[PDB]
Design a protein around this nucleic acid. Structure first.
Ligand SMILES: [Zn+2]
Ligand SMILES: [Zn+2]
Lengths: 73, 55, 472, 51, 320, 51, 30
RNA sequence: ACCAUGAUAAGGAUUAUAAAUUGAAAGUGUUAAUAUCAUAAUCAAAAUUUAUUAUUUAUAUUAAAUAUGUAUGUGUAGAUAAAAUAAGA
C-alpha cells in the first residue's frame, strides 16, 4: 500500500481509497496528428479521482492516546 | 452533426453503423421509452455531473 | 476510406546511433584502462615496499606488526608467494594470534586483484569474478589456505593452554578462521568451491566447531556456483526455521546469483519480490545488480519452440526494468550504485520501454511517424534484424421451458426480411443475388427493391410469354 | 505493478473496432497533519455572510 | 495497368503521375459492381413479327448495355455482349417466357463484355437443368482473353479474377484431353462457334430460325476481333463499340489501330439510313443520323477526299 | 464484446494465477520465519500515550 | 474488402516494427 | 444533358372439422392509363449574409346595427375505443 507514513504523534494515518479512470484510444485516435488533443481530452474528461474513507477507520487512537474521531467528532 | 440529406446518403452508402427501428417506437433504451426525450436529457446530466459529490 | 491497422504499434524512437554505441565502447575502454592503471601502480608500490624492507633491513629484525602489515598487503594484491616466508617466521616466532590468522586467510582471497578482475575482465559480473579468480593460482592458494588453517588450529591449542577437551573447537576463533577459510576457498577453482559444502563443512562438523551466519552464507554461495538449487534453498529453509533473527543480505545474494547460473529466471523473480515484501534485511546494490543482470540474461535468451517466427519473444522481459527501478526508489537503493556495464543495458531497456506524459501527447504526430518511415527507407540496412542476413454442478437433467413469460417483457420488433422467390421455379437458386443475404444497414430497402425488380421481371417475362404464343 | 503493467497492455491486441477503458480502485495511506492543519479555537470576531 | 518492373519502380514520374490522377491515394479506385439499389429493369426495346429485341441500358459502371434477341417461332434467345452486373433478372426473364438460351454473341472480348460471362453461363445453365449455352466469338480476341485477369486487377474486379473463361476451354476446334480410363462439363464444350474474319453478305450469317439471318461483320480498329451484328430484315445494326451516338470507339488501348477503325467505318456506307444502329454504350441512333451529325465520320471522309492514304480516326476519351 | 470478455478473462486468469502464486510462495516463506524490521518496530513504539 | 460482424474478431497477425527497427532519436529542433 | 427509369388503379388463389393456448393467423400470380434530359466544356437562385415610403397570406387587435327584407365551402388539423333508402339483370 503506497502513501506516506507518519510516526510523529501529530500525524495520523488514514487508510483511504482512490478510484480513477485511465482511458487510451487504440482504434482511430491511436496515432495521428489528432492524437495530441484527443488524448488530452480523454485525460481532462477523466480528471476525477474519488477519495473515499470509512468513518470506522477514523475512529482509532491518535499519537497522544486520545481517539482521533469520537462520537461528537 | 449532419443534415437529413447527408444522413440518408451515409445510410444508403453504408459508411456509418446504425440500427433501424420501427418509426413509431422509442428505440431500445429504457430511459427514452419511459419519459421521452426529456427523461434521457436528464439522465446524461445525472451521469456527467450529479453523480459526483463536488468539493 | 481504407482502414488503419490497430494492431500495428506507434512508431517511436527506441535506439542509439552508431556514433553513440562507438562512444560508449570507447569510454568503457578508458575506465578499463584506468582500473588496470590503478592496480599496477599500487602493486608496484607494495613490491617496492617489500624489497625496501628486505634490502635495507637485511640484518635488522623488524617488529612483527610491520611484517604482518606487509604480509596481508602482498596477499591482497595476488602475491601469495612473496608472503608465505613472512607468515612462516611469524608462526615460528609465535607472534601471530587468533585474529591475525583470520586476517591472513581473508587476505589470501585477494580483495585487490578481484577489484581489477571485476571492472576489467569479468565485465562487472559478480558471479564471473569467482570464476576468473580461480585461474590465478586457484589450487596453489587453496593449499596455502589449508596450510594456514593448520597453522591456525595448532596456535589456538597453544593459546588455550574449564572446557579442556572441548578447546579450541568451541571458541569464537575456531569458526572465524573456518569462515575465513571458506571465503578464501570460494575464490579458488571449481574443485575447491565444490569441497566447501561437502568436505570443509563435514570437517567442521567432525571437529565440533559451531558455525555462524557467515558459515552458511559461504556454503550457500558455494552451492550457488555449482548450480545446485535444491540444497541452497534448503539451508535458508533451515535458517528460516531456527535462526531467523541473524539472516543477513548475503543469503539472498547467493540465491539471486545461484538461480542466475542455473537459468531459472522464474525463481529469481520470486526472491526479489520476497525481498521487496519483507524489506529486512536491506537491499544492497549487489541485490539490484544480481537481479537486473538476471533480467538481461533472460531477455537475450533465444527461444526455440516457436523458433522466432516473427520476432524475439523474450525481449518483453525488459519491460519489467522500469518496474524494478521504481521499486529501488522506495527501498532506498540508489540507481547510481550500478555498474557501467549494467547501466548501459538498463538505459537500453528504458528507451525501449518507458515514456513520459509530455512525450505521450506528442509521440503520435504524423511528422514523427513519417520520419520513421523515411529513415527506414533511407538507411534500414544499418538498423534491422532482417537486413543483416442453472448451477451446472447440480444440473444434470436440465429443466426445460419453465413457463417464463416472454410476453410480459416487450421485444416485439424482431421482423426479418428474406429474399424474394426462394421456392419459385423460375428464379434460380444460385446467383449473384445470394450476396444480398449479407447486408445489415440497408436490409429493409434493398430487398424491397430486389422484390420489386424480380416481380416486374417475372411480370414482363410472363407477359412476353403470353404474347408470342398467341401471335403464332 | 506487474499485474497493472499486464492489464494496461491488453489494448494492443483487442478485437476489431473494440476499445476499452480501465478503472483502478486502490488503497492509499493519507496523513492528516495536525500541525499543518491544526484544531484551533474559533476567533473572537467570527466571520459572517459578508465574507 | 502493367507489370511493375525495375525501371517503373525507380522512376519518379511514375510516383508523380499517380499523385496527379488519384490524389494522395496513388492507387486507382476500381470499377465496382452495381448494387441491387440504383438498378433498373429489363425493357422491351423492339417487337417485330419475326424477332423481339429486349434490352437494358447502363447495366455496368462501364456504362455498357445488355441486349437479347428473342425469336418468336423457335422460342430461342441469344445474348449479345453478355455483361450485366446482375444476370439474375435475365435468368428469370428467360425462365418466365419459356425461352431456350442456345448461344451468346460477343462482339469483342474487352472487360466491358465478358466480365460476367461465367456468371451468365452458370446461372442460366442451372435453370435449364430443371444442350448447353454456346459462345460465338472471334479468335483474334485471344490476346484479350489472356489479359482478362490483368484487366480485373486494374478495375478492382477481384472476384472474377480466378475464373477460367469458357471460351478458353477445349472446344471442337481444339485437341481433346486424354484422360485416364478409370466429366465433360468442363473438358469439352461442343457448342462453340469461332467466327472468321472473311465476312461476306453471302454465307457469313447465323440462322436464327424462321428465316432471319444474323450477318456478322468483321470490323476491327477498336479491338483485334470486332464482330458487329446486322439484321437486314429489321434494320438493326449492333455496332458494339464501333459507332455510338456522335462518337466512335477508343484507339488509345492496346491492339487498337486508328487506320483499321477508319476502314471499319467505311464498310457500313452501303446500308440504308433507317438502319437503327444499336451500340454497346449509351443511347441508340440511326445510321443516317451519324452520316450527317457525327464529326468522327465527317473527319474520316474529309481526310479521304484531300488525299490521305492512311486515314487515322479514333477516340482517346470515351468507352472501353 | 461477449467473445472478447471470454478472451480477456482467460488471459487474466492464467496471468492472475501466476502472480498470486509467486506472491503465495513469498508469504509462506515469510510465515516460516524472518527478522522484524527495526523501522517497523519503531513504528509501533511511536505514540506518546498508548491504549 | 471488409470484415463481417459474425466472424470472430481476432487479431490476424502481430506486428513487431519497433523491435525490428531500432530508431535513434532524431528531432529537427536542437 | 432529351436512353430503354419509376410511381397509380384494377382483378386471383391455399389452410383451418381443435374449447387447448398469453396469443387459431400467415405466406404465393395477371391488365389498362401516366411517365422516362447523366460521356457533356463554366460561373455565386434562397453559394449566400444584411437593410429602406412599398406586394401578400397569416399574428393579434378590432366596432356599430331590431323601420322593412335577408345571407350555409372546398380545405386546413390532432389522436383515433358509433355504423343497413341501395339492387350479384
Ligand atoms: Zn471495347
Ligand atoms: Zn464497350
Amino acid at each position: 500500500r503506497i502513501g506516506p507514513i507518519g510516526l510523529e504523534p501529530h500525524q495520523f494515518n488514514v487508510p483511504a481509497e482512490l478510484g480513477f479512470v485511465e482511458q487510451y484510444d487504440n482504434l482511430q485516435y491511436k496515432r495521428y496528428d489528432w492524437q495530441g488533443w484527443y488524448q488530452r481530452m480523454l485525460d481532462v474528461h477523466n480528471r476525477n479521482v474519488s477519495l473515499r474513507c470509512r468513518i470506522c477507520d477514523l475512529q482509532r487512537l491518535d499519537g497522544n492516546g486520545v481517539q482521533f474521531v469520537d462520537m461528537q467528532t | 452533426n449532419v443534415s437529413y440529406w447527408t444522413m440518408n446518403k451515409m445510410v444508403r452508402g453504408g459508411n456509418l453503423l446504425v440500427h433501424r427501428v420501427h418509426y413509431t417506437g422509442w428505440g431500445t433504451d429504457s430511459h427514452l421509452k419511459k419519459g421521452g426525450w426529456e427523461h434521457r436529457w436528464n439522465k446524461v446530466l445525472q451521469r456527467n455531473v450529479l453523480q459526483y459529490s463536488r468539493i | 476510406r481504407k482502414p488503419q491497422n490497430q494492431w500495428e504499434g506507434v512508431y517511436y524512437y527506441s535506439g542509439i546511433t552508431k556514433r553513440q554505441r562507438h562512444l560508449i565502447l570507447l569510454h568503457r575502454k578508458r575506465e578499463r584502462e584506468a582500473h588496470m592503471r590503478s592496480f599496477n601502480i599500487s602493486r608496484a608500490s607494495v613490491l617496492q615496499r617489500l624489497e625496501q624492507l628486505s634490502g635495507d633491513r637485511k640484518q635488522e629484525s623488524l617488529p612483527p606488526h610491520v611484517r604482518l602489515d606487509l604480509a596481508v598487503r602482498l596477499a591482497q594484491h595476488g602475491l601469495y608467494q612473496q608472503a608465505t616466508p613472512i607468515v612462516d617466521e611469524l608462526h615460528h616466532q609465535k607472534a601471530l594470534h587468533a585474529g591475525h590468522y583470520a586476517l591472513l586467510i581473508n587476505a589470501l582471497a585477494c580483495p585487490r586483484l578481484g577489484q581489477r578482475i571485476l571492472h576489467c575482465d569479468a565485465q562487472c559480473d559478480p558471479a564471473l569474478t569467482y570464476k576468473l579468480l580461480g585461474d590465478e593460482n586457484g589450487e596453489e592458494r587453496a593449499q596455502e589456505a589449508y596450510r594456514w588453517f593448520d597453522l591456525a588450529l595448532t596456535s589456538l591449542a597453544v593459546d588455550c593452554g574449564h572446557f579442556v577437551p572441548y578447546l579450541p573447537q568451541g571458541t569464537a576463533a575456531a569458526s572465524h578462521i573456518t569462515n575465513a577459510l571458506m571465503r578464501t576457498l570460494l575464490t579458488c577453482g571449481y574443485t575447491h568451491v565444490a569441497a566447501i559444502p561437502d568436505s570443509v563443512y563435514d570437517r567442521m562438523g567432525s571437529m565440533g566447531i559451531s558455525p555462524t551466519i557467515s558459515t552458511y552464507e559461504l556454503v550457500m554461495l558455494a552451492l550457488s556456483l555449482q548450480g545446485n538449487m535444491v540444497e541452497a534453498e534448503s539451508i535458508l529453509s533451515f535458517l528460516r526455521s531456527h535462526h531467523s533473527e541473524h539472516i543477513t543480505v548475503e543469503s539472498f545474494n547467493a540465491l539471486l546469483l545461484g538461480h542466475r547460473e542455473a537459468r531459472q529466471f522464474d525463481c529469481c523473480d520470486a526472491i526479489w519480490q520476497e525481498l521487496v515484501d519483507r524489506r529486512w534485511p536491506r537491499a544492497s546494490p549487489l541485490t539490484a545488480e544480481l537481479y537486473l543482470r538476471s533480467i538481461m540474461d533472460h531477455a537475450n535468451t533465444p527461444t526455440s519452440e516457436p523458433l522466432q517466427s516473427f520476432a524475439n519473444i523474450n525481449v518483453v522481459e525488459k519491460k519489467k526494468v522500469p518496474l524494478v527501478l521504481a521499486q529501488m526508489d522506495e527501498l532506498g537503493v540508489p540507481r547510481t550504485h550500478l555498474s557501467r556495464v549494467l547501466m548501459d543495458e538498463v538505459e537500453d531497456s528504458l528507451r525501449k520501454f518507458q515514456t513520459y506524459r509530455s512525450r505521450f501527447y506528442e509521440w503520435g504526430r504524423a511528422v514523427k511517424q513519417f520520419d520513421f518511415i523515411e529513415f527506414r527507407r533511407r538507411n534500414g540496412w544499418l538498423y534491422d534484424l532482417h537486413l543483416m542476413k442453472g448451477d451446472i454442478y447440480y444440473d444434470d437433467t436440465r429443466g426445460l421451458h419453465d413457463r417464463s413469460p416472454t410476453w410480459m417483457n416487450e421485444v416485439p420488433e424482431t421482423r426479418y426480411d428474406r429474399l424474394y422467390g426462394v421456392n419459385h421455379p423460375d428464379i434460380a437458386k444460385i446467383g449473384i443475388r445470394r450476396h444480398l443475404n449479407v447486408e445489415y444497414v440497408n436490409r429493409k430497402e434493398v430487398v424491397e427493391r430486389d422484390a420489386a425488380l424480380m416481380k416486374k421481371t417475372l411480370s414482363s417475362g410472363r407477359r412476353l410469354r403470353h404474347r408470342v404464343e398467341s401471335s403464332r | 505493478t506487474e499485474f497493472e503493467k499486464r492489464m494496461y497492455d491488453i489494448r494492443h491486441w483487442l478485437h476489431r473496432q473494440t476499445s476499452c477503458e480501465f478503472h483502478t480502485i486502490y488503497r492509499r495511506n493519507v496523513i492528516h497533519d495536525s500541525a499543518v492543519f491544526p484544531t484551533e479555537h474559533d476567533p473572537a470576531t467570527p466571520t459572517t455572510h459578508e465574507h | 495497368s502493367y507489370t511493375p518492373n525495375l525501371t517503373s519502380l525507380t522512376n519518379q514520374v511514375n510516383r508523380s503521375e499517380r499523385l496527379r490522377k488519384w490524389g494522395s491515394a496513388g492507387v486507382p479506385p476500381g470499377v465496382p459492381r452495381i448494387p441491387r439499389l440504383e438498378a433498373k429493369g429489363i425493357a422491351i426495346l423492339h417487337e417485330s413479327p419475326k424477332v423481339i429485341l429486349a434490352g437494358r441500358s447502363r447495366c455496368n459502371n462501364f456504362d455498357s448495355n445488355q441486349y437479347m434477341l428473342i425469336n418468336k417461332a423457335t422460342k430461342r434467345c441469344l445474348l449479345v455482349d453478355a455483361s450485366d452486373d446482375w444476370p439474375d433478372d435475365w435468368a428469370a426473364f428467360i425462365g418466365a417466357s419459356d425461352l431456350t438460351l442456345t448461344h451468346v454473341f460477343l462482339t469483342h472480348c474487352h472487360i466491358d463484355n465478358i466480365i460476367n460471362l461465367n456468371a451468365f453461363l452458370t446461372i442460366c445453365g442451372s435453370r435449364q437443368k430443371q444442350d448447353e449455352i454456346g459462345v460465338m466469338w472471334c479468335p483474334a480476341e485471344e490476346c484479350w482473353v489472356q489479359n482478362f485477369k490483368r484487366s480485373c486487377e486494374r478495375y478492382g474486379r477481384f472476384e472474377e479474377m480466378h475464373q477460367v473463361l469458357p471460351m478458353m476451354c477445349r472446344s471442337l476446334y481444339t485437341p481433346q484431353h486424354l484422360v485416364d480410363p478409370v466429366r465433360n462439363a468442363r473438358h469439352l464444350r461442343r457448342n462453340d462457334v469461332l467466327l472468321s474474319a472473311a465476312t461476306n453478305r453471302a454465307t457469313s450469317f447465323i440462322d436464327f430460325g424462321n428465316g432471319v439471318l444474323l450477318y456478322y461483320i468483321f470490323s476491327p480498329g477498336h479491338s483485334p476481333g470486332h464482330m458487329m451484328l446486322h439484321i437486314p430484315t429489321e434494320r438493326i445494326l449492333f455496332s458494339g463499340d464501333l459507332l455510338f451516338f456522335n462518337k466512335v470507339g477508343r484507339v488509345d488501348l492496346p491492339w487498337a489501330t486508328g487506320v483499321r477503325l477508319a476502314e471499319s467505318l467505311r464498310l457500313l456506307e452501303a446500308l440504308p439510313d433507317n438502319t437503327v444502329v444499336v451500340p454497346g454504350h449509351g443511347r441508340m441512333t440511326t445510321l443516317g443520323r451519324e452520316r450527317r451529325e457525327n464529326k468522327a465520320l465527317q473527319q474520316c471522309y474529309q481526310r479521304q477526299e484531300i488525299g490521305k492514304q492512311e486515314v487515322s480516326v479514333g477516340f482517346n476519351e470515351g468507352y472501353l | 464484446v461477449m467473445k472478447l470478455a471470454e478472451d480477456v478473462c482467460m488471459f487474466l486468469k492464467d496471468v492472475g494465477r501466476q502472480i498470486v502464486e509467486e506472491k503465495l510462495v513469498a508469504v509462506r516463506r515469510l510465515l516460516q520465519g524472518g527478522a522484524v524490521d527495526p523501522e517497523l518496530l519503531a513504528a509501533f513504539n511511536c505514540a506518546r500515550a498508548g491504549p | 474488402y471488409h470484415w463481417h460482424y459474425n466472424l470472430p474478431q481476432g487479431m490476424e497477425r502481430p506486428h513487431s516494427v519497433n523491435r525490428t527497427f531500432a530508431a535513434p532519436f532524431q528531432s529537427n529542433h536542437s
